[PDB]
Design a protein around this ligand. Structure first.
Ligand SMILES: Cc1cc2nc3c(=O)[nH]c(=O)nc-3n(C[C@H](O)[C@H](O)[C@H](O)COP(=O)(O)OP(=O)(O)OC[C@H]3O[C@@H](n4cnc5c(N)ncnc54)[C@H](O)[C@@H]3O)c2cc1C
Ligand SMILES: CC[C@@]1(O)C[C@H](O)c2c(cc3c(c2O)C(=O)c2c(O)cccc2C3=O)[C@H]1C(=O)OC
Length: 535
């Protein structure tokens, strides 16, 4: 039989696809992205990288390019978030007072912070890093259909593509559908979505205008507009002369995208800024229906949904791109481990179990923010916010790859007062290696990391015995030994006492822990690893 031609075929070159590819390629996986478009879009779309995204971009080795690249903050390096009636006008409520304060809000639970690139800046950095690690991409190439092949006859997926020289077949070991909300992939498998559904409709206008005259210095940021005439939002880009405006509209009242003529648009831009000296130059006028939809299934056989295809969230709270990047990270490291023989196929089921709950957390937070910031009258239709940082940083996973003892139904915890329980991020704690001062969080992501208590030298020896046994990297660090704890807080935050240990996954999530010593640390650790990796 024939070697697959590629290990993974990723469909779509938005953030979900380029993430999955960059993190697959870094792991030595042969991955091909195909993209129907002739090139990456220059449009801003989703902007801003949250601290969880930043933690994964760090793992992925692109964090330093991300920080150097052009962001959307103003020339004074600041960014404000506000409800107002008009942009240059009087503030109804301030969500974030500055950028330094936005970062400050979660700094004690993470060493990563925020970045502020638009989608068109971030995608080129993903794509470049995928390519440097051996990934490949084909533009102007469209997926027509695919067939699947059971393990006897393969296993694999045969996909049919429409490129420039016409049609052809490609065999992959896996197919990832990162092909957007109207996903050819999801729709082809006949998978339904659930959730609130249509939320609202809005028209986006990207436009050019020098606001140097009508906006006071340092006033760059995101604005929720509650104007007598209209409902909307207003945003910066990475060019000081380019901006975005969104305006709500009712189709049931008879309003249509067609009504937002260049005229209406310049008019509403006039209104939003409360300056009519403005002559904008309109770049794009695009109607958008906002919704909340989650795929019933994130996987059928060797086909996976990732990104918007798996879940559409209202854009409110800037989580759209950040969730795709994270779906991709999860998919990557689990696919890599299975493809290399480090795990059995059972691990792939954790993808859905974990990222499908994450999708629900993201959507719920987005609806709640829509209510609090755009539609205060809707706050009851949906559960109240569980908290922004608890959703992005305090989230918990349950699956076969999380060995939890308790059964607390809570899906988040305060990330500022962490438990160290399985399923949550291993807590941020400042420690140092022999002089190098780092967060416990910066210790994660190569393969598996194990943290042992002061007395747990047996756990350290096990980390090597088990790596060798299973062929998985286990980096082990012991407190008071090769890892300095000045405040003596690692044991306490991770809940490992003096003699226990905490096993942390490739995405920085705690898989397992104990607060005491095992009878045979190597036997126990092997058993724990065999289980979460499906061996
Ligand atoms: C037009 C547009 C505007 C957006 N604006 C905003 C915004 O202002 N603010 C915000 O926060 N978020 C916005 N987003 C949403 C945000 O971009 C996405 O949530 C983020 O990109 C994650 O989505 P994704 O990559 O999974 O899918 P997408 O970003 O939709 O990428 C899917 C890609 O798959 C490609 N594709 C589709 N079908 C095929 C096929 N059959 N074969 C090959 N390729 C295919 C598409 O060309 C597209 O490039 C917008 C998205 C779109 C599509
Ligand atoms: C700091 C970054 C941040 O996440 C701040 C905030 O969370 C936010 C962002 C983005 C959007 C919306 C946000 O509220 C938002 O409401 C929205 C919307 O209602 C309708 C369409 C698009 C958007 C939308 O693109 C992100 C941002 O400011 O990017 C420029």
């Amino acid at each position: 039989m024939n070697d697959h031609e590629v290990d993974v075929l990723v469909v779509g070159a938005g953030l979900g696809g380029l993430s999955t590819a960059m993190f697959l390629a870094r792991q030595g996986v042969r991955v091909l992205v195909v993209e129907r478009r002739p090139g990456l879009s220059p449009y801003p779309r989703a902007a801003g990288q949250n601290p969880r995204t930043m933690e994964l971009l760090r793992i992925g080795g692109v964090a330093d390019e991300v920080v150097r690249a052009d962001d959307i903050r103003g020339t004074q390096g600041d960014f404000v978030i506000r409800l107002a009636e008009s942009v240059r006008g009087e503030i109804l409520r301030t969500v974030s007072e500055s950028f330094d304060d936005m970062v400050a809000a979660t700094e004690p639970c993470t060493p990563a912070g925020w970045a502020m690139l638009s989608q068109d800046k971030l995608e080129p950095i993903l794509l470049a890093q995928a390519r440097k690690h051996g990934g490949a991409i084909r533009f102007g190439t469209r997926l027509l259909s695919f067939r699947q092949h059971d393990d006897d006859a393969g296993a694999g997926v045969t996909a049919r593509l429409a490129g420039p020289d016409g049609e052809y077949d490609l065999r992959a070991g896996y197919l990832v559908g990162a092909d957007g909300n109207r996903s050819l992939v999801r729709e082809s498998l006949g998978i339904g979505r659930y959730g609130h559904g249509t939320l609202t409709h809005m028209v986006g206008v990207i436009f050019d205008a020098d606001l140097s005259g009508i906006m006071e210095p340092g006033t760059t940021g995101w604005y929720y507009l509650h104007h007598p005439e209209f409902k909307g939002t207003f945003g910066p880009t990475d060019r000081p002369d380019r901006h975005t405006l969104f305006v709500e509209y009712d189709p049931d009242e008879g309003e249509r995208p067609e009504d937002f003529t260049p005229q209406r648009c310049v008019e509403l831009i006039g209104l939003a800024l409360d300056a009519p000296e403005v002559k904008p130059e309109l770049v794009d006028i695009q109607g958008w229906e906002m919704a909340a939809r989650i795929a019933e299934r994130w996987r059928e056989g060797r086909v996976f949904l990732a990104g918007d295809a798996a879940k559409v969230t209202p854009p409110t709270g800037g989580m759209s791109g950040n969730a795709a990047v994270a779906d991709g990270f999860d998919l990557a490291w689990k696919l890599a481990a299975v493809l290399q023989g480090q795990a059995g196929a059972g691990l792939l089921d954790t993808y859905e179990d974990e990222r499908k709950v994450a999708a629900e957390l993201v959507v719920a937070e987005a609806l709640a923010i829509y209510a609090q910031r755009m539609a205060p009258h809707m706050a009851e239709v949906w559960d109240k916010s569980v908290g922004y940082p608890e959703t992005l940083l305090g989230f918990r996973y349950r699956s076969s790859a999380v060995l939890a003892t308790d059964d607390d139904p809570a899906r988040v915890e305060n990330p500022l007062t962490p438990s160290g329980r399985p399923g949550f991020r291993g807590p941020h704690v400042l420690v140092s290696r022999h002089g190098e001062r780092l967060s416990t969080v910066d210790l994660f992501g190569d393969g598996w990391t194990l943290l042992a208590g002061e007395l747990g030298a047996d756990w350290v020896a096990a980390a090597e015995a088990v790596s060798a046994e299973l062929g998985v990297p286990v980096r082990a660090y012991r407190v008071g030994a090769g890892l300095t704890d000045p405040e003596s807080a690692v044991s306490e935050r991770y809940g490992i006492g003096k003699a226990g240990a905490s096993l942390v996954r490739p995405d920085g999530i705690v898989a397992w822990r104990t607060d005491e010593a095992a009878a045979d640390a190597a036997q126990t650790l092997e058993g724990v690893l065999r289980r979460v990796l499906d061996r």
